[PDB]
Amino acid sequence: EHVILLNAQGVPTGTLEKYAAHTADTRLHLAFSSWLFNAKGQLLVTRRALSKKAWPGVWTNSVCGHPQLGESNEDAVIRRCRYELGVEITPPESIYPDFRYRATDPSGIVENEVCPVFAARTTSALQINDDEVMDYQWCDLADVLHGIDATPWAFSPWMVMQATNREARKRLSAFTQL
Ligand SMILES: [Mn+2]
Numbered sequence: 097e098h099v100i101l102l103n104a105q106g107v108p109t110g111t112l113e114k115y116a117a118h119t120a121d122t123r124l125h126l127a128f129s130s131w132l133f134n135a136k137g138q139l140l141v142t143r144r145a146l147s148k149k150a151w152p153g154v155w156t157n158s159v160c161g162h163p164q165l166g167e168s169n170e171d172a173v174i175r176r177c178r179y180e181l182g183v184e185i186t187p188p189e190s191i192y193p194d195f196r197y198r199a200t201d202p203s204g205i206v207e208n209e210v211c212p213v214f215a216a217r218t219t220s221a222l223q224i225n226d227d228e229v230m231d232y233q234w235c236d237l238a239d240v241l242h243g244i245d246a247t248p249w250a251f252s253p254w255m256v257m258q259a260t261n262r263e264a265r266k267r268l269s270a271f272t273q274l
Contacts, residue, residue, distance in 0.1 A: 099162045100126040106210055118150055120204045127209035130173045132158040134218045137272040139240055143231035150205045156252030173214050182223025188214040192264040199253035213258050215271045237268060
């Protein structure tokens with residue numbers, strides 16, 4: 097499993113194995129992010145396992161990851177939801193297409209990515225993968241956004257920045273509406 101390096105203008109330049117890519121000087125690469133809602137409209141918030149290299153044990157949006165060579169962002173989203181959650185989803189739909197970010201976790205790890213954000217719906221029961229996720233909560237988006245506005249540090253930096261963007265928020269809030 098790798099990561100696709102990117103230059104200033106967002107043009108692929110190479111490939112770096114994932115574990116070796118994330119350090120105290122991580123280079124810009126391709127990534128994605130997704131917020132999943134169940135049939136009933138409940139938002140799925142997950143907690144990253146204690147063993148993850150970056151932001152271990154942190155609460156964040158449903159699923160996020162790295163697209164591989166020759167893989168579309170939407171197929172990447174689908175692959176990680178089956179891998180990390182063992183769950184099926186509806187065609188992932190844009191929420192925040194131009195999302196870019198750089199943050200530094202508790203032990204100096206840095207994430208530097210161009211992260212298009214997507215939202216989707218769950219079409220099957222969760223089959224949590226213990227190596228990736230240690231816990232999860234099905235809740236009201238309203239609350240989650242309230243928590244993010246009050247205590248941001250309690251969640252992943254990207255979950256915060258994503259829901260702090262006006263358009264993304266309105267889009268997430270309407271997402272469950274028929
Ligand atoms: Mn990354």
